[PDB]
Structures are given as structure tokens and as C-alpha cells.
Amino acid sequence: LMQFTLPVRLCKEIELFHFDIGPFENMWPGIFVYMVHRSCGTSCFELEKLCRFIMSVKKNYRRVPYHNWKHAVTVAHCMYAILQNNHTLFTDLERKGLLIACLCHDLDHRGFSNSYLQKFDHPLAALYSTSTMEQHHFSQTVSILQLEGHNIFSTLSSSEYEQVLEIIRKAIIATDLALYFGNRKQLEEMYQTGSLNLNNQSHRDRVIGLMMTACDLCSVTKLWPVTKLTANDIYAEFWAEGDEMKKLGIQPIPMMDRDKKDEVPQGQLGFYNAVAIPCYTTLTQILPPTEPLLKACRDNLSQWEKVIRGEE
Ligand SMILES: Cc1ncc(C)n2nc(CCc3nc(N4CCCCC4)nn3C)nc12
Ligand SMILES: [Mg+2]
Ligand SMILES: [Zn+2]
């Protein structure tokens, strides 16, 4: 049968946590199939259905600066790297479901936060009172799965099908960063008082949620020039939201105010110390082979520190 392969530099570097999927859009589908095949098997999905699913996913990501199809594949590659470095901790269904969850987790994003949708009074804010976009991303996922010829899970039993859609739902909900803080506190306490138990399904759910936040934030674990150029995309969204807040007659939070461009370095430090470093610290405690992500994050924190000192 038909193995996907990549050029030698990609074949080798795609295994590393810091891999960048590159600017050739047309190679991102192949890169994802490559990853499904190695981390899950050539048997997990019928190729024709998988290809048709990937392409409908791509079509339902929008041309926004950050929350775009390149982000989805980037977040799926980080998950691939976690899965491959922790071969024996994850079930068959988890292997299948998590790469799919990652590819789908920001489906049909408009470049605006839950909070902007609530203040604008967007219809999605009435359908979904909390984790507004993330309930929408899971909804878009089920929609695409149900198109003719797109059911990549057709081979699964009714109960295996239900379990996988449940892993995907929880994995996508967990990418609401408002839920990450309490999730990481629970996991931190469970790990420290030795109560953490991976046969406990509600513990697995929390560990997978933390993997999700880690994959979602992985731009902070890249080579500095990647980290830095991705940060421009991230702010290009925030600042457009800030402009839209001002159009509603509301002073945006400083993160979203393009007039406070100068405070970005310090905003990055707060974010590394309050979100990223703690994320990868707890992740590394729970799955030791994920340490390169903590080590990369820490290197990028010291690059942002150099920027503030005017050495960068
Ligand atoms: C790298 C990355 N990945 C994912 C996400 C969700 N984020 N979010 C940020 C924003 C970090 C931030 N900047 C600022 N300001 C406060 C003063 C004014 C100017 C700057 N505040 N904070 C928290 N960076 C990321
Ligand atoms: Mg999201
Ligand atoms: Zn995301």
C-alpha cells in the first residue's frame, strides 16, 4: 500500500517538538497524513475519506492572521510530537481522536475572542453562553464528519464512535484558555499529593486538556524567529478586536490596544510566567519526555527579556 513520505530534512525534523511546517500551504495536508500514518497507522482511516475530510476542514478555516489553517496543522504537529514521545500511555481511540481534535480545534474562527462576541451580541453568544467559539469549533467538526464521504470514523463501533467524539469534544473545549488555569491547578495538586491516576477517566480528561493547551500555545516553543514572527500575527488579531471594541464605544484591555504596542515585550513576559511556563512545567512533570517544550519556552522567555533590555 501507499506510505506518505517527506523529504529527508522534513522526515527528520518533523519528529522534533520545534518543527515549523513551513510556508508551502500545499504540503500541509501531506504533512498531516504523514503524522496520522506514523502515530496511528496506515489503517486508522481510509485515505480517500481522510483526504476529503482534511480538505473540507481547510475550506472552513478563514483567512485571518493567526487562527488559520497553518495554526491548526501546527497544533496537530505538536500533538503528533507528544504522542510519539509517549507511545505507550495513549489508547488507539485517543491516538485517532486527538490529531483530529487538533486539526479541528479552531474551525471557522473569525479572529475575535469569546469576550468580543458576547459584547457585540453575536448569535453564537446566545447559542453558547461559555466557551462560545470552542462549542462552535466542535459543532463545525461534527458538521464536516457528517458530510457524504467524510466519516473517517465509519469503521468504529457505535460506542467507539461515541467515545472518540467525546474525546474530541473535551479536547476542543479545553482549548478555551479561561478553563486552563483551574485545570492546571487541579492537575498540579493531583501530581503533588500523588493522587494523579491515569486509569481514572476524569484524570485522563484533565491531562488531555493540558496537552491541548500545550499544543495550542506551541508557537512559544519554536526557534526564536518563528516565535517572534508568530507573535506579530497574534497581536494583528488582538489589535483588530481592540479597534472593534472601540467601535462599540468600549476601551479595549491593553492586550488589544494597538496604541500600547510598546508594552508587547512586557505582555509576553506576563504571558510566559502566568500561562506558558506553568503549562509546560506541569506537562513535563506528568509526561517527562515533553521536556523539550519547557526548555524551548524558557529559551524564548529569555529572548523576550533580551528584547526589553534592548539587546534584541
Ligand atoms: C504567544 C501567545 N500565544 C497564545 C496567546 C493566547 N497569547 N496571548 C498573548 C498576549 C500576551 C499579552 N500581551 C499583553 N499586553 C499587555 C500590555 C499591552 C501590550 C501587551 N498582555 N498579555 C497577556 N500572547 C500569546
Ligand atoms: Mg481557539
Ligand atoms: Zn488554537
Curated annotation (Swiss-Prot):
Residues that bind a divalent metal cation 1: H71, H105, D106, D216
Disulfide bridge map: none
Catalytic site positions: H67
Effect seen on changing D106A: Loss of activity and of zinc binding
Signal peptide: none
UniProt: 3',5'-cyclic GMP binding residues: H67, Q268
Tissues where this protein is expressed: Abundant in the putamen and caudate nucleus regions of brain and testis, moderately expressed in the thyroid gland, pituitary gland, thalamus and cerebellum.
Residues covered by the PDEase domain: 1-311
Residues that, per the record, bind a divalent metal cation 2: D106
Localization terms from the record: Cytoplasm, Cytosol
Binding site for 3',5'-cyclic AMP: H67, Q268
Biological function: Plays a role in signal transduction by regulating the intracellular concentration of cyclic nucleotides. Can hydrolyze both cAMP and cGMP, but has higher affinity for cAMP and is more efficient with cAMP as substrate. May play a critical role in regulating cAMP and cGMP levels in the striatum, a region of the brain that contributes to the control of movement and cognition.
Illness: Dyskinesia, limb and orofacial, infantile-onset: An autosomal recessive, early-onset hyperkinetic movement disorder characterized by axial hypotonia, dyskinesia of the limbs and trunk, orofacial dyskinesia, drooling, and dysarthria. The severity of the hyperkinesis is variable.
Subunit and partners: Homodimer.
Family: Belongs to the cyclic nucleotide phosphodiesterase family.
Domain notes from UniProt: The tandem GAF domains bind cAMP, and regulate enzyme activity. The binding of cAMP stimulates enzyme activity. Composed of a C-terminal catalytic domain containing two divalent metal sites and an N-terminal regulatory domain which contains one cyclic nucleotide-binding region.
Name of the protein described by the UniProt record: cAMP and cAMP-inhibited cGMP 3',5'-cyclic phosphodiesterase 10A
Organism of origin: Homo sapiens
Gene: PDE10A
